[PDB]
């Protein structure tokens, strides 16, 4: 008998407005959106060669992780459009009970968090030359302390911090207010205490208690309102306090909703399909996307590279000049709208380095070898040193000279594509240009983030001292990976970061935030698909002729969840390899 | 068909006049209110009291009944507590007609009579029930057809309405999103039982009294609030009944019914009943 | 309460409902839908689903479990009835073989199906998992080229279009057991180098002339080798170098 | 350890679950079996028994 069941597969709603009830079902688009948003049919994983090559449809699943992440972005993409009045809230309820009503709401806490960071970013630009803050604020980890520690006290001692928020709206509602604002006076008095109290060396972003215990106190002194003094030891037991309503359900132990995230797990666990639901969602609400469909092609594959004499940064021009076509062909209509702030333009060297910033290749001292890193010039000859001065001048030029007073982003890109010699200095300067804006978000998207911190094909002799590198080039010295290597989502006002880890080429490769020295909280372990969603997978494919089914296989959908434990790739082998027929 | 003001509605529909006050519509039942028995269920103490006194949570209801009494004897707005249109528009007809007919109303505190008989004064909700699938505004909701009913957990307090068709927006446009969200909408009706010495008397022009004396000194009403939904993605990792313990209140309560005016309210309405029903409307 | 006070003070105004739920067909409501940036882009495919979406909302299960116990999606009733569809079908994959071929000591446990019985003629030095791979990357390639690729590869043979006509009528063909039992229905060699063959010898001899020819092909890799021969049997229902060999032999018998 | 992460190839894997088809009780139970001795093919056929 063949009186088999049918089943519904697709969400009733469109893509911008899903809820938990549609987590299992699929969405659809034309096949043209690939070429429209992703150049030359390169996408995350193998969705083009395998799933699209047969189905001829750009069908996408919804993941538990995917929609939950998309929840956080919709707040960021609403606080911008409709900000909040601090005063009108506390009118409603007493100043005695703020925590149980105000702080612990999901729609209020981010509206507070989302604002304090904007004030923080404005000041960090002063503390960028310092080598120390490169070590602490490369991550978002210690940011979320300083922004939350202010808010936790608002539940404890509102009578000492509540006046700050209230008059901040007086300052915003007062035009002809030339002086700085309260928070931009607050955070300055914080960071000065960091340099004076913290330990210069051995100061880590990944470790909290070592940072708090090195800072016994904050000491604020506002002229108008406050001289409030703080003890940090009380927030040492639980460095990661976060409101229950978000965090039982947002993502497992996920904390930085504004900064970023990271997806790790076994092969085919589903990570390289979640962000595909995000990247498309990112466009249909007109939010900028920075695609990096695979870092394997940048770090574990041949591309031309050239070194600068001052800096160890190996310039790449052909690589950037191909990527920008992808960033352009997708986000063309927005960049025309976007002007430039010429006070920011024109500080990036041709090799990517910036004036104010620390040296991107400092002289390191390997203690165990008892030798410096600069010593590699002993093996050089006279002629090369003479050639270096000839290159030191030829590569001296910057883009500010030949390109003055543009109007949009494309004016930099159309010049960048047209001339190979200035691709990098056009690439990086766009990143400042998108990063300092208040018209459009930033979304930094990576698949294969693991490949970066791994060694590279790119050879050299100067890194022979590192027994791990073994005569290779790290990509934090390669120019183009610098744009995206830094897990700096907090730096982006109205921004977010998403990273993943591909392990198809590896077998049983345990990857996680212990392999990469990486803070806790900002990561999410993947796990396989549940049953009822693993059911519609089969019925979705059978309707679309992806895999060809025996009558033995049409109702094996709830059986293969044993055979796969909810894993995607362990099914695709069966679906395509027909290993069932052996048993 | 056209936009109408607050007072013009009364001046158009309260034109009628009648000599007999008992024949005239009027919600506040002077005489013959019945002591209702307190029902008790499982899912009633879950949200009705949450880190609060059972009484002080009810004392607010004991107060909001009061200004409603004054609001009838005194044409006022600030006193008039938060309540629906379709009752007020049908409750003030029962009052303002007496003002047009020459009758008068006054609020009286009969302390002695309430001391002559009957137990003390106090509010006790004798029925608390949750419902799902509907909103407090009586105009979004459709007929009995499209809704599918689950009368399973009536014994404990729950009823669930689920739609078969697509609901419209302000613009008159269907959605698929709106149906899904409507299936979450929970309302909390409560039937109160508050004995009171304060009463009302009608007094004809040059008449000390024209209404009968009350026997009850007990009066009832219904309050409702459409609740805030839980966090997103909380339904997933929880049992159903453990998920309803997490709805929370921020919207104010809303008087609906009063002394079995209209025999208690109904959310569903036939097609004609919706047409005769009016709602306040903005444009842009 | 803001909207109330405005209406109380005669700031904002009132009128009847323009919105009323009239019985209409599923097609007419398409006019009044609220579509977003995505249904617009792919109209032809979604526009036929609004007819189906709205139909399913009528037929919903009133079961307690899908709403009141844990998270889950309402299902039909066939999902419970057809639970035996696998167990009843997997046997039929095996019912081709008579188990009397295989009742020896502890061989049935390792050789019960047809696919378990081809391999040992092809095993080299005890490797089985390898042979299981090479045969499947080949047979899987057969099904794929017939479905998605062109047929210039399939220009030579004659049974080409006649084979897809046998696929689409029966999804049973994707069982490799049924792919080849079909091939062996063509090829039941009753006689060979002159001797009568019992059923327990007729089956054996058919396979060696396959396994031998797999080793005689010129192509290097087994994947390339093994494909070419199944094509000679699948895509020549009447003909083959191996089948014309057989039909050559009946003439020797009938004349003698 | 996990099922796909110990028995990698599927012919090692269908053997252990060949009874589970014959039962038709799929997903009803939770399995935890501990094995030590021999090689992979011989280590799987024990799981049938």
């Amino acid at each position: 008998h063949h009186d088999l069941p049918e089943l519904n597969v697709y969400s009733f709603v469109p893509i911008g407005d899903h809820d938990f009830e549609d987590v299992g079902k699929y969405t659809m688009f034309p096949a043209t959106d690939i070429q429209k948003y992703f150049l030359n049919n390169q996408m995350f994983g193998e969705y083009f060669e395998v799933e699209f090559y047969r189905t001829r449809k750009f069908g996408v699943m919804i993941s538990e992780e995917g929609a939950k992440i998309v929840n956080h972005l919709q707040h960021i993409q609403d606080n911008k459009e409709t900000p909040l009045n601090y005063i009108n809230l506390f009118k409603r309820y007493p100043t005695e009970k703020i925590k149980e009503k105000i702080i612990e709401d999901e729609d209020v806490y981010p509206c507070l968090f989302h604002d304090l960071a904007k004030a923080a970013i404005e000041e960090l630009e002063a503390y960028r030359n310092n080598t120390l803050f490169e070590r602490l604020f490369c991550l978002p980890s210690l940011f979320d302390l300083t922004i939350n520690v202010v808010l936790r006290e608002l539940g404890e001692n509102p009578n000492a911090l509540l006046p700050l928020f209230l008059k901040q709206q007086e300052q915003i509602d007062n035009p002809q207010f030339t002086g700085k604002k309260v928070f931009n006076q607050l955070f300055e008095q914080i960071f000065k205490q960091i340099n004076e109290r913290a330990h210069p060396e051995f100061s880590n972003p990944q470790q909290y208690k070592q940072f708090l215990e090195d800072i016994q106190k904050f000491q604020i002194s506002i002229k108008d309102c406050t001289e409030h003094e703080i003890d940090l030891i009380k927030y040492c037991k639980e460095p990661r306090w976060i409101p229950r309503n978000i965090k039982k359900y947002s993502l497992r132990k996920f904390i930085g909703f504004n900064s970023g995230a990271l997806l790790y797990g076994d092969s085919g666990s589903g990570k390289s399909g979640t962000l595909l639901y995000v990247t498309m969602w990112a466009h249909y609400k007109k939010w900028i996307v920075l695609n990096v469909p695979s870092a394997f092609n940048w770090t574990q594959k041949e591309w031309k590279f050239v070194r600068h004499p001052k800096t160890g940064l190996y310039i790449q021009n052909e690589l950037a000049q191909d990527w920008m076509k992808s960033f352009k062909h997708a986000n063309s209509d927005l960049l025309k709208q976007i002007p430039v702030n010429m006070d920011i333009y024109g500080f990036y060297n041709l090799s990517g380095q910036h004036d104010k910033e620390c040296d991107a290749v400092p002289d390191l001292y390997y203690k165990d070898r008892k030798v410096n890193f600069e010593e590699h010039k002993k093996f050089l000859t006279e002629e090369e040193n003479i050639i270096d001065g000839e290159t030191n001048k030829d590569f001296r030029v910057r883009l500010k000279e030949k390109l003055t007073n543009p109007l949009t982003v494309l004016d930099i890109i159309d010049y960048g594509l047209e001339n190979e010699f200035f691709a990098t200095n056009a690439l990086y300067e766009v990143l400042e240009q998108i990063r300092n804006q208040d018209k459009f978000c930033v979304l930094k998207v990576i698949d294969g983030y693991n490949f970066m911190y791994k060694r590279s094909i790119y050879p050299s002799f100067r890194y022979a001292t590192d027994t791990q590198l073994r005569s290779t080039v790290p990509p934090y010295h390669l120019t183009v990976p610098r744009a995206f290597l830094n897990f700096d989502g907090h730096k982006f006002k109205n921004g977010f970061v998403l990273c993943a880890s591909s392990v198809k080429n590896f077998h049983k490769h345990i990857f996680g935030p212990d392999s990469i020295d990486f803070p806790l909280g900002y990561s999410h372990e993947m796990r396989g698909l549940p049953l009822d969603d693993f059911r519609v997978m089969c019925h979705y494919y059978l309707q679309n002729d992806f895999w060809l089914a025996d009558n033995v296989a049409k109702n094996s959908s709830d059986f293969l969840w044993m055979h796969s434990q909810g894993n995607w790739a362990q099914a695709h082998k069966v679906m395509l390899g027909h290993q069932l027929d052996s048993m | 068909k056209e936009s109408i003001t607050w007072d013009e509605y009364f001046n158009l529909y309260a034109t009628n006049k009648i000599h007999n006050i008992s024949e005239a519509k009027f919600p506040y039942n002077f005489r013959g209110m019945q002591d209702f028995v307190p029902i008790k269920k499982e899912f009633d103490n879950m949200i009705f009291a949450k880190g609060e006194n059972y009484a002080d949570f009810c004392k607010q209801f004991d107060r909001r009944m009061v200004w409603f009494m004054k609001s009838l004897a005194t044409n006022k707005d600030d006193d008039l507590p938060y309540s629906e249109l379709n009752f007020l528009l049908q409750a003030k007809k029962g009052a303002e007609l007496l003002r047009r007919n020459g009758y008068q109303i006054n609020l009286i505190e009969d302390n002695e009579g309430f001391q002559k008989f009957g137990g003390k004064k106090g509010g006790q909700p004798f029925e608390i029930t949750h419902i799902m699938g509907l909103n407090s505004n009586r105009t979004r909701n459709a007929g009995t057809d499209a809704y599918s009913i689950i009368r399973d957990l009536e014994e404990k307090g729950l009823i669930m309405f689920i739609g078969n068709q697509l609901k419209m927006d302000e613009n008159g446009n269907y959605d698929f999103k709106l149906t899904r969200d409507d299936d979450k909408q929970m309302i909390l009706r409560v039937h109160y039982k508050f004995a009171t010495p304060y009463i009302l008397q009608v007094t004809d022009s040059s008449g000390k009294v024209v209404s009968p004396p009350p026997e009850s000194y007990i009066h009832t009403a219904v309050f409702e609030n459409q609740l805030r939904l839980p966090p997103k993605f909380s339904r997933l990792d929880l049992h159903f009944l453990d998920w309803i313990k997490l709805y929370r209140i921020q919207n104010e309560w809303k008087l609906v019914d009063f002394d079995r005016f209209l025999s208690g309210n109904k959310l569903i309405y036939s097609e004609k009943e919706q047409r005769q029903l009016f709602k306040g409307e903005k444009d842009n | 309460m803001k909207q109330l006070k405005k209406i109380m003070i005669n700031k904002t105004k009132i009128m009847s409902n323009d919105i009323i739920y009239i019985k209409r067909t599923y097609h007419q409501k398409i006019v009044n839908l609220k579509i977003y940036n995505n249904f617009k882009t792919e109209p032809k495919f979604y526009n036929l689903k609004f007819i189906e979406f709205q139909n399913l909302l009528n037929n919903v299960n009133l079961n307690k479990v899908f709403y009141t116990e844990y998270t889950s999606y309402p299902l039909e009733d066939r999902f419970a009835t057809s639970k035996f569809h696998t167990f009843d079908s997997y046997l039929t994959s095996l019912e081709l073989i008579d188990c009397t071929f295989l009742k020896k000591k502890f061989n049935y446990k390792y050789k019960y199906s047809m696919f378990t019985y081809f391999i040992p003629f092809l095993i080299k030095n005890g490797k089985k998992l390898s042979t299981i791979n090479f045969i499947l990357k080949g047979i899987s390639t057969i099904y794929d080229n017939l479905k998605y690729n062109k047929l210039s590869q399939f220009e030579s043979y004659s049974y080409v279009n006649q084979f897809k006509h046998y696929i689409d009528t029966a999804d049973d063909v994707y069982n490799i057991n049924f792919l080849i039992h079909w091939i062996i229905n063509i090829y039941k060699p009753v006689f060979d180098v002159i001797v009568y063959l019992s059923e327990k010898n007729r089956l054996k001899t058919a396979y060696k002339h396959i396994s031998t020819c797999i080793r005689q092909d010129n192509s290097a890799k087994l994947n390339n080798r093994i494909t070419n021969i199944f094509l000679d049997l699948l895509l020549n229902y009447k003909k083959s170098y191996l089948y014309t060999r057989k039909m050559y032999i009946y003439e020797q018998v009938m004349d003698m | 350890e996990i099922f796909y992460r110990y028995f990698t190839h599927s012919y090692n894997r269908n053997i252990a679950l060949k009874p589970m088809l014959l039962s038709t009780q799929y997903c009803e139970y939770d399995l935890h079996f501990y094995v030590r001795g021999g090689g992979v093919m011989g280590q799987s056929h024990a799981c049938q028994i």
């Binding site: 549940p530 049953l531 009822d532 969603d533 709830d558 | 997933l236 990792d237 | 079961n63 479990v65 116990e69 844990y70 998270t71 889950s72 999606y73 299902l75 009733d77 999902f79 419970a80 639970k83 | 038709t24 009780q25 799929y26 997903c27 009803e28």
Partner: peptide, 29 residues
Amino acid sequence: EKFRVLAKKTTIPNRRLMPPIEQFRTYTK
């Protein structure tokens, strides 16, 4: 019943819920 849910997102159908040809030959013989 027909279906019951074990736990979060795990639906399964529940399972814990005169030959004539002989009638002839028994007559003939």
